[PDB]
Paper text:
The genomes of most C. perfringens strains contain three separate genes encoding highly conserved GH33 CAZymes targeting sialic acid glycosidic linkages: the nonsecreted 43 kDa [name], and the two secreted 77 kDa NanI and 129 kDa NanJ. We report the X-ray crystal structures of these domains in complex with relevant sialic acid variants revealing the molecular basis of how each catalytic domain accommodates different sialic acids.
Neither structure showed any significant perturbation of active site residues relative to either the unliganded or Neu5Ac complex. The 9-O-Ac group of both ligands project into a preformed pocket formed largely by N123, W124, and Y203. The 7-O-Ac group of SAc3LacNAc also projects up into a preexisting space in the active site. This reveals how these modifications are accommodated by the active site of NanHGH33, which is notable as they both involve the residues in the active site region of NanHGH33 that are not conserved in NanIGH33 and NanJGH33. In NanHGH33 loops on 3-blades forming the rim of one side of the cavity are extended, thus deepening the active site. In the SAc3LacNAc Michaelis complex this tyrosine packs against the galactose to which the sialic acid is α-2,6-linked, providing additional interactions in a +1 subsite.
Author numbering: 20 to 382
The structure:
């Protein structure tokens, strides 16, 4: 596997890389992102977000800094946990959480986190140049239906989707102040104006849910979310663009995540040659438990053949993750090509999983 972001050899001399992201462009361009964790693996540290671009199918990469933190705190200023999407116009949107203090983003403060904000950048030139950082939460002109008891929120860490009519849907996670407690939930946000303004959906029926991704299936939204301390990835379905949610049985609890806290994963849809709509999930098996997060595997479900059980297709990273921070992955499928980026002992590796999709396509 090619080392995309190397902790031992990078142009920023960063000691650690975390939270990968990948987008397969329509013309074959591969666009990837990752946290630039300069001082180490800690989440509450000095972090920017990088971009690696390839015009030769992953052989050579051009590196840049897509987003910088607010530059306020040389120790804690950070923009992190990227959530990306490609609109129908080709516009590439990146959504990230922004902080500059110490402490968990969801549990530290009992009121709205003062240094918290959601920053968004977009590129109209296929990832060559990026726009200015646009604050989505400093006022109320960009995001509608933001709960008043919001401690903070950010993207679902991964990739969004585009509906039939062109509506962009982004996975999201929110922390809410409810009855002297801080409960965090998963949900979605959507934009009908190419990402200029957004409307916030409602929370999923269960707390302790966070990082997630949604797919579109015949107008509905099917979510595969991180369900902490449940041992599995939860799944919900929505028929009103994320306003109401029901448990999606065919996927709920099917992907096990081992003991301890959950872990981020990716959930994308692919349409095989026989017309079937399949779901591809990447997540560590975590058979060794807790934050070890071993064996980043790729699972498959056939929505048009739901009697067939979820299949383990391959394990792109059949090793233990680093307990300091690992296990995150992101899949991207476009034009019968499948690619993955994942964390690998402080590094970010890349793989082309297209031959495995060809085994699925049965052509």
């Amino acid at each position: 596997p090619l080392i995309l972001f190397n902790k031992d050899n990078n142009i920023w001399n960063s000691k650690y890389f975390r939270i990968p992201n990948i987008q397969l462009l329509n013309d074959g361009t591969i666009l990837t992102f990752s946290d630039i964790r300069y001082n180490g693996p800690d989440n509450h540290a000095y972090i920017d977000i990088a971009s690696a671009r390839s015009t030769d199918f992953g052989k050579t990469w051009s590196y840049d800094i897509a987003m910088k933190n607010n530059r306020i705190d040389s120790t804690y200023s950070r923009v992190m946990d990227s959530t990306t999407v490609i609109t129908n116009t080709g516009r590439i949107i990146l959504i990230a959480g922004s902080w500059n203090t110490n402490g968990n983003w969801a549990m530290t403060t009992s009121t709205r986190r003062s240094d918290w904000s959601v920053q968004m950048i977009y590129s109209d030139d296929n990832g060559l140049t990026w726009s200015n950082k646009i604050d989505l939460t400093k006022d109320s002109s960009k995001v509608k239906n933001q709960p008043s008891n919001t401690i903070g929120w950010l993207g679902g860490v991964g990739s969004g989707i585009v509906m039939d009519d062109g509506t962009i849907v982004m996975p999201a996670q929110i922390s809410l102040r409810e009855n002297n407690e801080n409960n965090y939930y998963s949900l979605i946000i959507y934009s009908k104006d190419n990402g200029e303004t957004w409307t916030m959906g409602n929370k999923v029926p269960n707390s302790n849910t966070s990082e997630n991704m949604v797919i579109e299936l015949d107008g509905a939204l099917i979510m595969s979310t991180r369900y902490d301390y449940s041992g599995y990835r939860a799944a919900y379905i929505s028929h009103d663009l994320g306003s109401t949610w029901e448990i999606y049985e065919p996927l709920n609890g099917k992907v096990l995540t081992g003991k301890g806290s959950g872990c981020q994963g990716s959930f994308i849809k692919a349409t095989t040659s026989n017309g079937h709509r399949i779901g591809l999930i990447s997540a560590p098996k975590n058979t060794k438990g807790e934050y070890i997060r071993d064996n980043i595997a790729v699972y498959m479900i056939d929505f048009d053949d739901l009697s067939k059980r979820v299949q383990e297709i391959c394990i792109p990273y059949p090793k233990d993750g680093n307990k300091l921070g690992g296990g995150y992955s992101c899949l991207s499928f476009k034009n019968s090509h499948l690619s993955i980026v994942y964390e690998a002992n402080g590094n970010i590796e890349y793989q082309d999983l297209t031959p495995y999709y060809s085994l699925i396509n049965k052509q």
